[PDB]
């Protein structure tokens with residue numbers, strides 16, 4: 001199977017930028033390569049076919065180039081609609097194979113997360129479960145590392161993290177971290193801590209409560 | 212106007228089968244190949260196969276040889292993809308994709324979501340998230356142990372809400388929702404999350420208590 005390596009896998013960019021996405025094939029594909037866009041919450045649209053030919057309704061700021069095994073898509077002066085996912089697809093051989101994609105995300109200023117910790121509700125404790133929840137809200141850039149601490153000592157098992165997509169109003173990210181225990185296990189310990197590491201602060205942001 | 216109109220979302224039990232249709236219009240149906248593409252874990256696209264509707268002849272990715280069966284009905288201009296002995300690993304989005312037989316120029320259908328699971332329909336447990344100082348306060352609702360997707364979370368019926376994608380804890384979904392309000396407003400007035408789950412016909416209000 002022809003492998004298609006696509007670079008970069010994500011990039012934060014700005015309006016008016018010139019952006020280049022590369023697609024490297026594990027053998028020469030003789031320009032039998034397409035580029036595809038998927039905008040958020042939509043299906044796909046063909047951009048370029050056979051290396052360098054624009055599909056219908058594709059503006060001139062998009063161009064494709066390359067040959068043999070090395071190909072690229074350039075977006076000249078990036079516009080607002082161009083904040084999307086991009087994929088190459090090889091059709092020199094069966095099976096057709098795809099690159100792993102490139103997400104173009106909106107560059108903006110850094111923002112520290114607003115972090116909130118929540119003890120289990122009474123009602124869930126009734127069920128025998130104990131979910132401690134931590135929201136980390138409205139931060140940029142997207143990279144954030146979370147640690148849970150029980151009485152000042154870490155736990156990694158039973159943690160579930162969900163990230164938002166880039167926010168439609170301030171271009172930030174948010175995520176939740178949930179630590180799920182049994183009541184039994186939960187009742188044993190007193191202090192519960194959610195610990196976030198992020199570029200906006202050289203020390204961790206810690207949120208904690210006491211049972 | 213080229214249209215490729217696919218059938219609707221699918222939910223099935225493991226070992227079962229599903230048949231997805233792709234209704235084509237606005238062109239000569241036999242003149243273009245029809246491909247099927249799988250998208251799973253967001254970023255992973257795979258070519259399942261194609262069918263030349265003129266010959267009815269089919270080509271398959273090795274990986275999908277006995278999973279998928281592509282046919283057309285040349286008379287209703289419809290392509291089908293049949294997926295059999297379904298597993299958890301089959302849950303994905305499936306697209307039909309018309310390609311130009313000479314150029315590889317493409318037009319894509321809207322996609323069809325398939326979810327394969329052993330779970331029977333199950334209403335959510337909804338737990339308030341109140342804190343254990345500052346001019347606003349964040350609260351939340353943990354929406355736990357439901358199936359299938361999806362649910363709607365609304366806060367006092369009505370901006371400042373984050374809704375986090377659901378995750379699959381042991382055959383069953385969990386998602387949380389946060390809201391930020393003025394501290395002057397809570398606990399002094401009522402804050403409620405309402406969780407609607409169509410599939411189980413449930414609507415349930417939980418008041419946030421301090």
Ligand SMILES: CCP(=O)(O)OCc1ccc([N+](=O)[O-])cc1
Nearest residue numbers: 089091244246308310311312315
């Ligand atoms: C050689 C002409 P073809 O084999 O009819 O099309 C090539 C082709 C097939 C599928 C995709 N796709 O994105 O799924 C893109 C391009």
